[PDB]
């Protein structure tokens, strides 16, 4: 399916190449570059590009284009998810998915590509197998390697590969047995210029860090099962129990992974913790406009809102801006016309606010609409939907491991008009 892979530096350079079926000429990337030239931006590059021969499928992320070469028809998502998975793998092995990380670990990188894809069709997949086939590079490991030889490749098949539980490593051993569940909710919302909520929905994910030895069976129970509607389950989950009991029993893979992905029932309304008061004006051919925004606790759940970043995408008419924050730090970007305001947190007794005037381009026309604002924010110990976990019950192992659970609500895209 996938004949070759090119990593393209966003500056326009063939950073790295890998071939599985035949040597694909580098000239094929001319079409990619053409598309890049005809693209509005790096995020507006069409995932699928047809060329005279071969189809290109690509993923933009981490300021890097993963470009694959396809010979014959293959379901686009098959390729996309696989390719995306590869990028995630690089982050797992090197801690960061970047060209610099690769430049230092080229050999390992190249080997990983060889293990993951077999002549165009996926072979090594899940990290709990791949980590055993090729040991990840560490400082201490390289020290060992300088003595015994650079051996990071296993000489046997990971036992789990041939088991009925392939996502878990066999022979796992810890003395400090523990498990963590991080329930993170996502507030994705569209706010009207009046402050009214146009659209809002809570999505969520339960991440897990498992450090339990042997073959443990974890089981989660929730405080309000009814909040869970469209729920994606990690392959390890025996959905039949979920279906009949609504209980998450499963043999966990170790390491870090996402367990549950879900949508909160639309029957209940989404609490919006942040309101935005925003007075802004522009004038036809004026050298000056106005700006006054206040960020505060709407349905803040009685909690402190923190990790706040306020980003306004301004119209070309703006040249500069005489604007002063009541909280954190504020900088205007005249190159891309962006108001970056680092709020940090909202004090119950004192609100973050930007107050001042806008330096506009005299002779330039008034913006057809006032610029929108994206806001990042979060609350510790908060599961804003109300979804809490009722009980964790481990079977199969002798341990009384740490059973930790954390609730954090984190904003997704939060766009407010004007």
């Amino acid at each position: 399916m996938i004949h070759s892979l090119f990593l393209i530096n966003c500056s326009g350079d063939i950073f790295l190449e890998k071939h599985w079926k035949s040597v694909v000429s580098q000239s094929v990337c001319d079409y990619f570059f053409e598309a890049q030239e005809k693209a509005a931006d790096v995020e507006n590059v069409p995932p699928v590009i047809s060329t005279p021969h071969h189809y290109l499928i690509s993923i933009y992320r981490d300021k890097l284009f993963f470009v694959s070469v396809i010979q014959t028809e293959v379901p686009p998502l098959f390729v996309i998810e696989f390719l995306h998975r590869v990028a995630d793998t690089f982050q797992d092995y090197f801690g960061e998915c970047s060209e610099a990380a690769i430049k230092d670990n080229v050999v390992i990188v190249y080997e990983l590509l060889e293990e993951m894809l077999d002549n165009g069709f996926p072979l090594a997949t899940e990290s709990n197998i791949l980590k055993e086939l090729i040991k990840p590079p560490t400082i201490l490991r390289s020290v060992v390697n300088s003595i015994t030889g650079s051996s990071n490749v296993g000489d046997t098949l990971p036992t789990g590969q041939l088991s009925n539980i392939p996502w878990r490593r066999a022979g796992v051993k810890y003395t400090n047995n523990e498990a963590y569940f991080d329930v993170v909710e996502e507030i994705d919302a569209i706010i009207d210029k009046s402050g009214s909520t146009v659209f809002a929905e809570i999505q969520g994910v339960i991440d897990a860090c498992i450090k339990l030895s042997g073959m443990p069976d974890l089981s989660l129970s929730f405080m309000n099962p009814r909040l869970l509607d469209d729920v994606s389950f990690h392959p390890c989950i025996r959905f039949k129990r979920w279906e009949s009991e609504r209980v998450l029993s499963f043999i966990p893979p170790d390491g870090n992974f996402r367990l549950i992905s879900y949508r909160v029932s639309s029957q209940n309304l989404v609490a919006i913790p942040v309101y935005v008061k925003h007075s802004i004006s522009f004038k036809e051919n004026s050298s000056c406009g106005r700006f006054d925004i206040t960020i505060g606790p709407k349905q803040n759940m009685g909690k402190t809102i923190e990790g706040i970043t306020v980003t306004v995408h301004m119209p070309k008419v703006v040249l500069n801006m005489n604007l002063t924050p009541t909280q954190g730090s504020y900088t205007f970007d005249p190159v891309t016309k962006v108001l970056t305001w680092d709020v940090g947190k909202i004090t119950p007794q004192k609100l973050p606010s930007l107050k001042g005037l806008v330096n506009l381009q005299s002779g330039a026309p008034k913006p057809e609409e006032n610029p929108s604002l994206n806001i990042q924010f979060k609350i510790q110990q908060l599961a804003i939907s109300g979804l809490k976990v009722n009980r964790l019950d481990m079977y199969g192992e002798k341990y009384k491991p740490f059973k930790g659970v954390k609730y954090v609500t984190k904003a997704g895209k939060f766009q407010v008009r004007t």
């Binding site: 963590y180 510790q380 976990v389 009980r391 740490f402 059973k403 930790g404 659970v405 954390k406």
Partner: peptide, 8 residues
């Protein structure tokens, strides 16, 4: 690392 998590 356990700090910040609730026991369950």
């Amino acid at each position: 690392s356990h700090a910040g998590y609730q026991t369950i």
